[PDB]
Amino acid sequence: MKAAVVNEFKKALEIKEVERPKLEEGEVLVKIEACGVCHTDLHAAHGDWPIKPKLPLIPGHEGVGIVVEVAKGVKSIKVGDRVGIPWLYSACGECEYCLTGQETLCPHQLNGGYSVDGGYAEYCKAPADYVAKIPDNLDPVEVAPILCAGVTTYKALKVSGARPGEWVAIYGIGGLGHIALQYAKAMGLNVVAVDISDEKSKLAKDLGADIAINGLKEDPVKAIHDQVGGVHAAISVAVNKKAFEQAYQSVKRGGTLVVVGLPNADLPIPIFDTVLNGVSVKGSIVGTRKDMQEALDFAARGKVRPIVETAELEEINEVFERMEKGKINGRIVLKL
Amino acid sequence: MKAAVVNEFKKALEIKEVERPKLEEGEVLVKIEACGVCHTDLHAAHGDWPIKPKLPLIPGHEGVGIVVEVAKGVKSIKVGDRVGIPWLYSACGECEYCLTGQETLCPHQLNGGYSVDGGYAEYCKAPADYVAKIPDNLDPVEVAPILCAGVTTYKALKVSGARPGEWVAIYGIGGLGHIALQYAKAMGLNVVAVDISDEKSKLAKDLGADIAINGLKEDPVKAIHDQVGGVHAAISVAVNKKAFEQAYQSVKRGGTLVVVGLPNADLPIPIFDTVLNGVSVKGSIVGTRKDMQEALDFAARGKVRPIVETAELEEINEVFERMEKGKINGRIVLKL
Amino acid sequence: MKAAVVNEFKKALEIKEVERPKLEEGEVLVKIEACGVCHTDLHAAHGDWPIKPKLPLIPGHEGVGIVVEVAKGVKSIKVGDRVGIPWLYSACGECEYCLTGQETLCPHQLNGGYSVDGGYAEYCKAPADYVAKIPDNLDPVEVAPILCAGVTTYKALKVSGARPGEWVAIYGIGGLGHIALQYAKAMGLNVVAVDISDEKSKLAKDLGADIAINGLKEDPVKAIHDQVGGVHAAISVAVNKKAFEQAYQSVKRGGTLVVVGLPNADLPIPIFDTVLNGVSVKGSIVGTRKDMQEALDFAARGKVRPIVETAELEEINEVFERMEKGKINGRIVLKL
Amino acid sequence: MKAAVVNEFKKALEIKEVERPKLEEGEVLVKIEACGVCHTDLHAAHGDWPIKPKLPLIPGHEGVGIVVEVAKGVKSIKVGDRVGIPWLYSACGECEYCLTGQETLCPHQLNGGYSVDGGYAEYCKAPADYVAKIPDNLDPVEVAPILCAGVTTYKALKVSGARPGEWVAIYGIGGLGHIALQYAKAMGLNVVAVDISDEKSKLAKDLGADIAINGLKEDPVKAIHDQVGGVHAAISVAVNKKAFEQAYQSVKRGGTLVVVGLPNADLPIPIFDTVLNGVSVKGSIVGTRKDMQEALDFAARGKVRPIVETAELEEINEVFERMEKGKINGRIVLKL
Ligand SMILES: [Zn+2]
Ligand SMILES: [Zn+2]
Ligand SMILES: [Zn+2]
Ligand SMILES: [Zn+2]
Ligand SMILES: [Zn+2]
Ligand SMILES: [Zn+2]
Ligand SMILES: [Zn+2]
Ligand SMILES: [Zn+2]
């Protein structure tokens, strides 16, 4: 089996031959057709997060492929299905959060391409109970971002409380933000999209945004206040200190700021104003299995189309180099 | 009419005589039996808050008195009723937040003892539509802190989402905390009380706390996780950097931290861990008129008893710098 | 002033000159341009409801016009605005439901066209605090049904708990249903529209329905179950016993049936299945002033277009027996 | 193994020796210490429900006992634990409802003592994933009714939306009602208890009820409206036509009526008034595994104590005929 392997942190990945996974009870083997790439894989490759991955590691948490083998007793998933192996690789099923449909918080969870070998290979293994069933409408390459950017942003907009007709602000129309934009519109929301580029403001407007702001030409918060009077919710994707503060202060009283990005250090919040304005700051990333089904259904109905460009497994270090220089407009999917 | 007046910021209040208020339509004149004092009155006297009160100012937002005069058209309040003038002196009645029962967020709101003359006098004026109706069961000295600490902490626990049988952490057993703890117990909650003193821990235990922690002898986040497994909600009264730090870390995954104190500068939060653990940070101060009714009823049912000491209007500057040195165990109420 | 008056029940309305309304404080006089007609006006003319209107009565609760005169101290509405005088003519502003933004449930409420003279006239009076401000985009004759059918069905879909992406069933594509359709579509919902005619099936599919069913040709409950597996929510507009039964049994487990129609008598429900399936049966009619602004905004943005026929005020009784035999495809509005 | 077996519906149960259960993977063998009895067992023995149990059947869904054998791969349940085998014997774990923590609605669920042999025996089998963990504080006999009556009524009060300080009404203080009012009091609610006996009125008053009503001496609807102005929520345990209407009309506008009883036929509801008052009728029985843990914790803390009388397995037909005559004051638990 060919696989791109992280041998040790910061040092380039080695495309090399390794054994195929063998199944234990409840697992299926997936012949990978595609696997999306995002910044989580980078942080997995660099090991710069608080809890580090197990080396050597096959990254990838957006693998889409065909089930070619099922272990004894797997009935729900059948050989031939097209499934996804997401970030939420497995959960305990018995804890506080598993019992209440909050599988994303399970303290015993395994994470695909981080705590366990992911889809940067020709075959990947996963538990039948946690794979995502890909709808028949969708190509594996175009769907792979939904397993990550899709479910994360869709769940964040549910968490935000924004109801149809209300205004939402999305700070950062990058990898996730350009996908967060289409979910918001499909959820009956009016969107103000905020970025730092005339190109992305054009991108956002073409993807459906009602208002696009080049944040380096207009102060976005007083433009949001002057035009729509503040937003009921704001999705903070860009988590640099300025965009986070700007996303916060765009939220009117009694509104919610949902943060979906993972910043490098702590972030300051004017708690003083937070108390007198009844504002909430909620954290949210990825989603529950039920969240996954709904996120994928929006794509199956055509309401959310990721901007994708394919790359070969061998180019994985060049995609990473390309990702650190910020020249990825959208997301890049590995093809197999 | 005798009144304690702020003529200039940070200089001592002058007890002196001044005009009785005369009513325009919709307002009532109450002769004040008692008026509580909290730190908000001092921040009005020092004017160290972003938006300052215009001088001269009669402070006091916890005034309880007897209606002795009603303007023309006052259908509700009658002469002889015992009413309270709270922090939410008035609201527009037609904005976004007034139509949805969120009067605390009205951008045109006037605040008792800050933007309008309050209860540091023998007579105060207030609109009939926004005065609190004090229940017949209670003594004006006993119920004045409910108008502030009572409704604030009760509404905070409501928005905390903590349900009967769940565990709540209250950081700061001070003016608000000792009242917050009684409300939590009355809502079926198990309480962990956290403070900086063996005496305050022995105060919270007496008031009903299931667990009381001296924060300078045990690591409180160590004890809460070891004994309870993290709390579902935490009320942050003490908003110093380390207490805010500990209160946050005591909330388990998916839980909410409600902040009720007003800090002097921004506060840092590990937004990284906030995202991965689905944690919410909500701000909450004071409560709506409906909130005020429900808070007063708990006190009318004997479930909340504020620890109160009396003082008279002339020693108002002595209670202020007694408050700044921090040995007011509970709250003080002005006697008239 | 010309007005269509109900002198007594079940006999024809008389067009007749009457006195122009006198404005007391807080009220406003409106020169009516158009006033909608629905079945509530008929029940008001026939007096066949539990609590009857006191006679003589000028019906009409969907009146749209120009304010020509404001009383003393009218704070918000200035002469020249276009407003609407809905079914909730006024509320006390003090009770349990007024304080929490549930003004529709105020036990002291007055109802336009029923408890007070409505818009079946050239001029109508209404309190400034409770008239709907029509947006500038909309012409008075097409927006009149939003005051009734628009705010009712929109609030009903909010009460239903149906979230974007989910399926809803709308039983009855009549007056309220054809408007319910568009609101649901604008809220991200997929819609199954059920009625008794091939003509209304195309009517629903014409305005956005994903599925239309002629209830007299297919079993709609088996159709809904075979095609979408039951609906999270169902809106019951047709409250004849067979449509109510079908609407209920189209709701899946854990779902909600919102009823907006007003039936003649009690209706039977399989509470046995309600208990074991976790189903809710909620009632909802009209909407609060906030609900009215939101429902009006959807029409302002062209997302809800009522199907409308004009008639002169003198044809009112022709419109009524027209209505009693089901000739009306949509709604009819009086023109002035 | 000794067991009470239903060989044929309506004909007495036979206490007879049968084969003890054999373990397949994931299951545990429990030696029953106690097993409560309720009317669900009666309807299982009479086979008078829509979907009947297949015979022969060992009833019992409140069996408490000690685990004496676990199949291989069972690691969470350990030999020696005291577990419960509730009505929710097993769920599929993948459907719409199992994914969202609503496993009570799983269409593939198996029911203890109905779809599979239950606790009317010395040994009963159950899946480890779905047994209830009995707290160490409590004796198997007094904890058995928590498995049924306890979790049902606790969930129904959670579904009722009733919040601390608000008033609840419990109609029928029999088997479920006398556990319901304890839960309500433990959740900070004020309880009006309604029955048809002065002996049960006093029983409720002894168990914590704030007001007890004998419905056959006072009109309970006028008593509730005149003493408290209607209740925000009402639990309907007695589902006879008269008490169902009384429970409904006890609910004030915007309130919720939760029904936990299983009536024999459809019940009429004045849908006309349901719409105009915005009242909800919700159905709720048994609870989720998480609900079971919270229900059991209230008993562990001593806030819910069922009224229990012991009988022996051989007297199973004599408690049944005791049950049909209505001589059961509370609940009766079989002892082994
Ligand atoms: Zn990703
Ligand atoms: Zn878990
Ligand atoms: Zn306002
Ligand atoms: Zn205060
Ligand atoms: Zn109408
Ligand atoms: Zn009212
Ligand atoms: Zn039972
Ligand atoms: Zn299931």
3-state secondary structure A98-142: HHCCCHHHCCCCEEECCCECCCCECEEEEECCCCEECCCCCCHHH
- State CA C111 to chain mean position distance: 13
Nearest CA in chain C to D282: C280
Cβ(C180)–Cβ(C203) below 8 Å: no
The neighbour count for residue C51, using CB atoms within 10 Å, is 10
Last residue of a domain, one of B285, B302, B319: B285
- Using a CB–CB cut-off of 8 Å, the residues of D that contact C are 50, 96-97, 102, 104-105, 107, 239, 244, 253-254, 259-264, 266-285
How many CA atoms lie within 13 Å of A167's alpha carbon, on the beta-carbon side?
16
Residues B136 and B275 grouped into a single domain: no
- Nearest CA-CA partner of A258 in A250, A266, B250: A250
Å between D286 CA and nearest CA of chain C: 9
Record: contact B290-C94, CB cut-off 8 A:
no
Question: How many residues are recorded in chain C?
Answer: 336
For C244-247, which contacts have Cβ atoms below 8 Å and span 24 or more sequence positions?
C244/C171, C244/D271, C246/C171, C246/C194, C246/C215, C246/C220, C246/C221, C247/C169, C247/C171, C247/C194
Instruction: Give per-residue burial for A68-89: e unless 16+ CB within 10 Å, then b.
Output: ebbbeebeebeeebbbbbbbbb
Chains meeting A at 3+ CB pairs closer than 8 A? Answer: B, C, D
Residues A199 and A251 grouped into a single domain: yes
- Nearest CA-CA partner of C25 in C127, C103, C123, C173: C127
Residues 6+ apart with CB under 8 A from D120: D3, D4, D5, D13, D35, D41, D58, D59, D60, D63, D113, D313, D316, D334
Residues D113 and D219 grouped into a single domain: no
Record: contact D129-A93, CB cut-off 8 A:
yes
CA A109 to ligand 2 center in whole angstroms: 7
Residue by residue, DSSP assigns A204-260 as HHHHT-SEEEETTTS-HHHHHHHHHSSEEEEEE---SHHHHHHHHHTEEEEEEEEE-
Most C CBs within 10 Å, among D272, D273, D277, D288, to test the C interface: D272
Last residue of a domain, one of C285, C310, C327: C285
The C-alpha atoms of residue B224 and residue C275 are separated, in whole angstroms, by 39
C101: nearest CB among B94, B100, B129: B100
Residues B176 and B40 grouped into a single domain: no
Cβ(D119)–Cβ(D113) below 8 Å: yes
Cβ(C227)–Cβ(C193) below 8 Å: no
Residues C213 and C174 grouped into a single domain: yes
Per CB-CB distance under 8 Å, the chain D contacts of A293 are 99
Annotated binding site of D: 38, 61, 92, 95, 98, 106, 148, 172-177, 195, 200, 260-262, 331
Q: Can you give the CATH number for the domain in which D243 is found?
A: 3.40.50.720
Cα dist from B44 to B20, B65, B113, D139, whole Å: 22, 22, 8, 59
The C-alpha atoms of residue B286 and residue B87 are separated, in whole angstroms, by 7
Residue type, B206: D
Find residue A6's DSSP bridge partners. Answer: A57
Cβ(C124)–Cβ(C52) below 8 Å: no
Q: In the block, which residue shows the tokens 């059948």?
A: A78
Q: Can you give the CATH number for the domain in which B59 is found?
A: 3.90.180.10
Chains meeting B at 3+ CB pairs closer than 8 A? Answer: A, C, D
User: Helix or strand or coil: residue A169?
Assistant: strand
Q: Residue A87: which domain range?
A: 1-148+286-336
- Nearest CA-CA partner of D298 in D224, D187, D214: D187
Backbone angles phi, psi at B64, to 5 degrees: -125, 125
Residues D154 and D144 grouped into a single domain: no
User: Helix or strand or coil: residue D318?
Assistant: helix
Annotated binding site of A: 38, 61, 92, 95, 98, 106, 148, 172-177, 195, 200, 260-262, 331
The neighbour count for residue B37, using CB atoms within 10 Å, is 28
Cβ(C184)–Cβ(C164) below 8 Å: no
- D40, exposed or middle or buried, with CB in 10 Å at 0-12, 13-18, 19+? buried
Record: contact A272-B102, CB cut-off 8 A:
no
The C-alpha atoms of residue B75 and residue C25 are separated, in whole angstroms, by 14
Residue type, A201: S
Residues A213 and A141 grouped into a single domain: no
CA C130 to ligand 3 center in whole angstroms: 15
Record: contact C186-A188, CB cut-off 8 A:
yes
Which ligand has an atom closest to residue B59 CA?
A: 4
Record: contact D99-A101, CB cut-off 8 A:
yes
Per CB-CB distance under 8 Å, the chain D contacts of A101 are 99-102
Last residue of a domain, one of C285, C301, C326: C285
Residues B260 and B301 grouped into a single domain: no
What's the start-to-end Cα distance of chain B, in Å? 12
What's the start-to-end Cα distance of chain C, in Å? 12
Which ligand has an atom closest to residue C144 CA?
A: 5
Record: contact C290-B101, CB cut-off 8 A:
no
Residues A66 and A144 grouped into a single domain: yes
Residues B204 and B240 grouped into a single domain: yes
Å between A246 CA and nearest CA of chain C: 27
Cβ(A235)–Cβ(A211) below 8 Å: no
Q: What's the total number of domains in chain D? A: 2
- Nearest CA-CA partner of C100 in B102, D335, D251, B209: B102
Residues C278 and C297 grouped into a single domain: no
- Entry resolution (Å): 2.8
Find residue C17's DSSP bridge partners. Answer: C2
Residues C10 and C139 grouped into a single domain: yes
For chain D, count helices (H), then strands (E).
11, 18
